[PDB]
């Protein structure tokens, strides 16, 4: 059905009305989203059906119709834009300077913006517009504020 490059909402009709569970990126004929958004389940796009191809619960990522295509990385210095797609609201770019998540296995970029859970999967962008990662897997700190990791997969 719809294979056009761009940002998409992930919806369900299982609960009351139409509910937005997350967001995703279509690029090179592949749909990229967060594992916790779909739980690996098949997707519908008009008359078309998207089946999962690769996924990993620990990375919290899933690709549909083909392998993971997004490979751009945060440079460690520059400001980025969250292309936020909130539930029932229009797509909006929010510029911010990322923080850092320090882990026993290496440092990762982090974005400190407050958005409802249905915004998981919204892409994070570099100055050329390349997707450096997805927003929506992180932690809730001290006052109920949200900090997400900059989650990127590996292109084969």
């Amino acid at each position: 059905g719809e294979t056009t490059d761009g940002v998409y909402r992930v919806m369900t009709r299982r609960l009351l009305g139409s509910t937005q569970v997350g967001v995703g990126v279509m690029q090179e004929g592949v749909f990229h989203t967060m594992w916790h958004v779909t739980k690996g389940a098949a997707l519908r796009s008009g008359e078309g059906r998207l089946d999962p191809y690769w996924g990993d619960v620990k990375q919290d990522l899933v690709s549909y119709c083909g392998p993971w295509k997004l490979d751009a990385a945060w440079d460690g210095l520059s400001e980025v834009q969250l292309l936020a797609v909130p539930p029932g609201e229009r797509a909006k770019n929010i510029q911010t300077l990322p923080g850092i998540f320090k882990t026993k296995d290496g440092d990762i970029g982090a974005v400190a913006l407050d958005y409802p859970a249905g915004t998981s999967g919204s892409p994070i962008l570099d100055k050329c517009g390349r997707v450096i990662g997805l927003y929506g897997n992180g932690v809730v700190i001290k006052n109920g504020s949200y900090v997400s990791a900059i989650t990127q997969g590996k292109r084969e």
């Binding site: 056009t4 594992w35 997707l43 620990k58 990375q59 911010t96 850092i100 296995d105 400190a112 932690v139």
Partner: protein, 39 residues
């Protein structure tokens, strides 16, 4: 059943709303893909 709807183009917008801080946090990733604060 889940379905997708197009929400827009992936572009950088000059003069967008600039907000948010850059915190440095010590975190732990468990086997279920969940992050937690380490202090």
């Amino acid at each position: 059943d889940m379905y997708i709807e197009r929400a827009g183009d992936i572009t950088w917008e000059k003069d967008a709303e600039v907000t948010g801080n850059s915190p440095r946090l010590d975190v732990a990733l468990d086997e279920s893909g969940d992050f937690s604060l380490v202090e």
